[PDB]
Amino acid sequence: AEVARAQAALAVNISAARGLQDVLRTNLGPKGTMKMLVSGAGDIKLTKDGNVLLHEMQIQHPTAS
Amino acid sequence: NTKRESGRKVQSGNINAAKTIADIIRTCLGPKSMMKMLLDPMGGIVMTNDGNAILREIQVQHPAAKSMIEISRTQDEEVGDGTTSVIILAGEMLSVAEHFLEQQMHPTVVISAYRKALDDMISTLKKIS
Amino acid sequence: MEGPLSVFGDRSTGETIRSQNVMAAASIANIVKSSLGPVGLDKMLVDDIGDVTITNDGATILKLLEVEHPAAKVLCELADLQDKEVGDGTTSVVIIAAELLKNADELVKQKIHPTSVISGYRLACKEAVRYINENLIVNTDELGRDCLINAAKTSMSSKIIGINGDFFANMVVDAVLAIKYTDIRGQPRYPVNSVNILKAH
Amino acid sequence: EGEETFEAAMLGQAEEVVQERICDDELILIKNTKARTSASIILRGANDFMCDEMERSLHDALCVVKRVLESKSVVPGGGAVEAALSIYLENYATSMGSREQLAIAEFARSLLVIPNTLAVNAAQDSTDLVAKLRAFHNEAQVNPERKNLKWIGLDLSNGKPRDNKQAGVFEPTIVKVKSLKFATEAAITILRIDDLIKLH
Amino acid sequence: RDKPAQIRFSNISAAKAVADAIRTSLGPKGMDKMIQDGKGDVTITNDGATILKQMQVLHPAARMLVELSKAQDIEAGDGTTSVVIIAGSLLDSCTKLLQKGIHPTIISESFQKALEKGIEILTDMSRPVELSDRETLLNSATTSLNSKVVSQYSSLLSPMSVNAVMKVIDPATATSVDLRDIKIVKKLGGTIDDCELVEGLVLTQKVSNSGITRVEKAKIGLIQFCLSAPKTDMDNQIVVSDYAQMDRVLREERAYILNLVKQIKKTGCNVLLIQKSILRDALSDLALHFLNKMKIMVIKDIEREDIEFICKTIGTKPVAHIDQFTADMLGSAELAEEVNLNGSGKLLKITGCASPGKTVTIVVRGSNKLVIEEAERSIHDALCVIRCLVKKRALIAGGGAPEIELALRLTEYSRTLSGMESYCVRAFADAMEVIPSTLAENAGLNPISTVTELRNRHAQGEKTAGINVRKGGISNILEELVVQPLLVSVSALTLATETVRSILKIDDVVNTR
Amino acid sequence: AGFDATNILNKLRARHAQGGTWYGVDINNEDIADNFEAFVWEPAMVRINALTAASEAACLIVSVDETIKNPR
């Protein structure tokens, strides 16, 4: 089919990550918060911890893997 | 049935598929390497320095995208390596040769330069090996 | 298939299908042209999708192409039939036919009896055909300096794989001499590959 | 079965059965098989492909020795033989006149695409070859002769007429008389429909 | 209304459009067709003569041309195109007269005038032939067989064509001696030279093996019964719930028929034609073995025409049930013969059969089907072209040429009539000349050369002479070695003549409820 | 004259493969024949003249794929 190459493939990578990452930056130290997490189940989850937010749901990108 | 196919279009797509497959793989080559990361249609990412691992696991196409894995596998079995070389080598020779030479408009002398380049390559190798 | 969209089945009357057929003969005969002769480039041809074949032989290509057009059909099967004669001229008989069917048909319309234009392609054939056997002008293996021996060396020297062809000038004439089978129907024909030829390096 | 008796009818009759190993190669060599003269040519290559290498170059020499034995003489291979026939047969058209200048010239002009497209496939192409072909070929010499006052031959691994006049890369006389009829055939073949209809 | 006016034009639209390209006729002209059919069926089509009948058309106005095609062939056997292609010539005049404002009935009646004036001239030119002597029979067969499939096998087929009609020939000339009396039986095996004209009733009946009804005093019967047995005709008291119960009734079935086939063997009738009417299924599959065991030829539910051939030709009728032996209304055959040529093939010959001075039977033979075909169709028109002579004698030309001779000379009648129709017949009179032009039309490029001169030449050759499309060149067209019997075109004239005025007899098209 | 080119001219080219002298189509006679005998005539001058002017503007524009202008 098609592909991406040079810095075009790179731009998609580095942008998707830092587009997802700063979303997670809302929370750290005590002065972070508890990020609302609703997966496909519908349950609200509030976590300042990475593993919950990271392994439940993600805005889907090749970097999100 | 009435059908015919004309000249450059396949040759282009050949050169096209030839060099493109060569690109990341030749940058994945060497002490300073790169990585070829596929993104599956399902969303799974596949990162391998070997595009033969990438291309076979992704769309394989009627042009040399069909003819690159065959000669890669031909390069896979015999010695066991050079797997990344042939497609970066075949994509390397065809582009620079053909167009300028097909701009000089001829297939045949192009064919001979291979066997020409084959022996000198054998020569200076076997010499400076 | 150009022409009206209401009626079909090779039915335009007209020259539409006829021009289509000189076009239908063209593209089919066009395929052969770049495959024409051994110097004809080997044509990678995709039989289905991963199914693919690389063929510079017209007849082998003509096997692959399913003919909806009779033009396509009369060119294929006949060069397929000339392939079942020998196979020398497969790519040959194809190409000239693209022009001649416009040459064969056209003037029969213009009459001067319906039968005249056709033998003109038969007579000039026989003319050439008479001329054919008349030619040792180039390639004489009916005679020669060594005749068949140097003809071997020469036919070696044509295809020659090295400075050899000398020992292989004799081997080929051995092939007719080693096979005495004297092929049936009175032919003194000796199959060249029926010799025991045992390859050892 | 291994207890079965054996008789002499399976025994070969020749001067000697002698086992000769030369070039690290031993064959059972039946010397002068008596019922009929026999010969076998053991190739010697530098490697195995070399034997195949030399073998295909024999095949030119092989069939062409055999094919001229099939039917005598030959043509000069390639469309050069017809490249002279064109103006031969277009003059053979010209004096005929009327329809018979038309069809007979239409047939001879159609001959000429083969050699070019032959040389085209070899990248010796067209304008080069028509410069090569019937510039050699003449009405001044129309004659097949036995010889060349014109070079009417075309060698193809090449695309160009060459100097080898025993060359097996020129065709014999056989398929030529055939293929022309077949070339005339595919043309006259499509003539044949009478009236017209549509099954509907 | 407008619909009445348009539909006749719409008829003239679809109809006349068909009858025209129906002329490439003869010639090696135009590129061969692989016809994808109206349902999508790829069909390789050639030789318009059969392409006539082959043609699948819609609309009433187009199909009447197939109806027109069917008409001439069965009539003469010759000139399949001759009747249709002139419907192109007809609807030429028709529209122009409707464009002239001429009334449909007048244009209709104009068909009859030119027809009478046409059958006038075609007979005027035609040169009479003797349909008794072998000679023009051979000759009309010759040229027809010269236009048929086998020119080489036109030789032996000719006496087999000539003697066939001369078997059925009727005193002097008359329209008679049909092809129904002729029974053409394809015989696998043999060759076209081995095709055999047999005088008597031959059947296409193909039964088991050989030596079966090869004997002498072998009559060929028709039975509108079949043989009895328990579980054939006579009763079974035992019922089959059980394979053992199945066996004793079949055993009793076989054992009884074995006695009956003796009674057929002692009948003198070694071919029963066993009714396709099935009693239990009538003649048992257990019985067929037994009738054949007595060298009597019966195959299950014998082919119905053979039943009627034995009725018609031989006069055989059914008999009483074989239980009663036979009333011996089975016709008189002291020989019925199963002939294997090359030890192969099934042909029932009835020799010594009652034949009514007719039902000559050509046995068209060959080792192939094509071989039988090439024979069978060729002799057929040779049978026909002689049947043509017998029906209506002499000869005109062939390939449309003599019609231009009619066309020239009819315009003279179109000169005399001095009516609207004198113009109408005239509007048709030269519309006839389109045929050889359109015969030579379809092959090519740079078109216009021969067409008007395909007409002009004949008028230059005037009233006797014109161009002969088969051999080329101008002469008296009726014999160049180009002929069809005078029957063929006068048979061609009236039919298309007839069918077209129906279009004018149409007030308006309809569709049934 | 109401004739085919080809045949009529191939006739001539037959006649010009054969007699070749004056043979040519004669229009108001509607036929082909030796024209100078037939009185069909023109003084040889303009022919060469036309022949000179024939191949000339021919060999000129055949060297023209390039034509140049100004609007201004």
From Swiss-Prot, chain A:
Coiled coil: none annotated. It is found in: Cytoplasm. ADP binds at residue 29. It comes from the Eukaryota. ATP binds at residue 29. Component of the chaperonin-containing T-complex (TRiC), a molecular chaperone complex that assists the folding of actin, tubulin and other proteins upon ATP hydrolysis. The TRiC complex mediates the folding of WRAP53/TCAB1, thereby regulating telomere maintenance. It is linked to De novo genetic variants in nearly every subunit of the TRiC complex, including CCT6A, have been found in individuals with a broad spectrum of brain malformations, and clinical phenotypes ranging from mild to severe epilepsy, developmental delay, intellectual disability, ataxia, and other features of cerebral malfunction. Belongs to the TCP-1 chaperonin family. Component of the chaperonin-containing T-complex (TRiC), a hexadecamer composed of two identical back-to-back stacked rings enclosing a protein folding chamber. Each ring is made up of eight different subunits: TCP1/CCT1, CCT2, CCT3, CCT4, CCT5, CCT6A/CCT6, CCT7, CCT8. Interacts with PACRG. This is T-complex protein 1 subunit zeta. The gene is CCT6A. The chain holds residues 11 to 75 of 531 of the full protein.
Curated annotation (Swiss-Prot), chain B:
Mg(2+) binds at residue 81. Its main location: cytoplasm. GO terms for cellular component: cell body; chaperonin-containing T-complex; cytoskeleton; cytosol; extracellular exosome; microtubule; zona pellucida receptor complex. ATP binds at residues 30, 82-84. Keywords: Acetylation, ATP-binding, Chaperone, Cytoplasm, Disease variant, Disulfide bond, Hydrolase, Intellectual disability, Isopeptide bond, Nucleotide-binding, Phosphoprotein, Ubl conjugation. GO terms for molecular function: ATP binding; ATP hydrolysis activity; ATP-dependent protein folding chaperone; protein folding chaperone; RNA binding; unfolded protein binding. ADP binds at residues 30, 82-85. It is found in: Cytoplasm. Belongs to the TCP-1 chaperonin family. Component of the chaperonin-containing T-complex (TRiC), a molecular chaperone complex that assists the folding of actin, tubulin and other proteins upon ATP hydrolysis. The TRiC complex mediates the folding of WRAP53/TCAB1, thereby regulating telomere maintenance. As part of the TRiC complex may play a role in the assembly of BBSome, a complex involved in ciliogenesis regulating transports vesicles to the cilia. This is T-complex protein 1 subunit gamma. The chain holds residues 13 to 141 of 545 of the full protein.
From Swiss-Prot, chain E:
It is found in: Cytoplasm; Melanosome; Cytoplasm, Cytoskeleton, Microtubule organizing center, Centrosome; Cytoplasm, Cytoskeleton, Cilium basal body. It catalyses: ATP + H2O = ADP + phosphate + H(+). ATP binds at residues 27, 79-80, 148. SUPFAM superfamilies: GroEL apical domain-like, GroEL equatorial domain-like, GroEL-intermediate domain like. Its EC number is 3.6.1.-. Component of the chaperonin-containing T-complex (TRiC), a hexadecamer composed of two identical back-to-back stacked rings enclosing a protein folding chamber. Each ring is made up of eight different subunits: TCP1/CCT1, CCT2, CCT3, CCT4, CCT5, CCT6A/CCT6, CCT7, CCT8. Interacts with PACRG. Interacts with DNAAF4. Interacts with DLEC1. This is T-complex protein 1 subunit delta. It comes from Homo sapiens. The gene is CCT4.
From Swiss-Prot, chain F:
Disulfide bonds: none annotated. ADP binds at residues 42, 47. It is found in: Cytoplasm. It comes from the Eukaryota. ATP binds at residue 47. Belongs to the TCP-1 chaperonin family. Component of the chaperonin-containing T-complex (TRiC), a molecular chaperone complex that assists the folding of actin, tubulin and other proteins upon ATP hydrolysis. The TRiC complex mediates the folding of WRAP53/TCAB1, thereby regulating telomere maintenance. It is linked to De novo genetic variants in nearly every subunit of the TRiC complex, including CCT7, have been found in individuals with a broad spectrum of brain malformations, and clinical phenotypes ranging from mild to severe epilepsy, developmental delay, intellectual disability, ataxia, and other features of cerebral malfunction. Component of the chaperonin-containing T-complex (TRiC), a hexadecamer composed of two identical back-to-back stacked rings enclosing a protein folding chamber. Each ring is made up of eight different subunits: TCP1/CCT1, CCT2, CCT3, CCT4, CCT5, CCT6A/CCT6, CCT7, CCT8. Interacts with PACRG. Interacts with DLEC1. This is T-complex protein 1 subunit eta. It comes from Homo sapiens (Human). The chain holds residues 453 to 524 of 543 of the full protein.
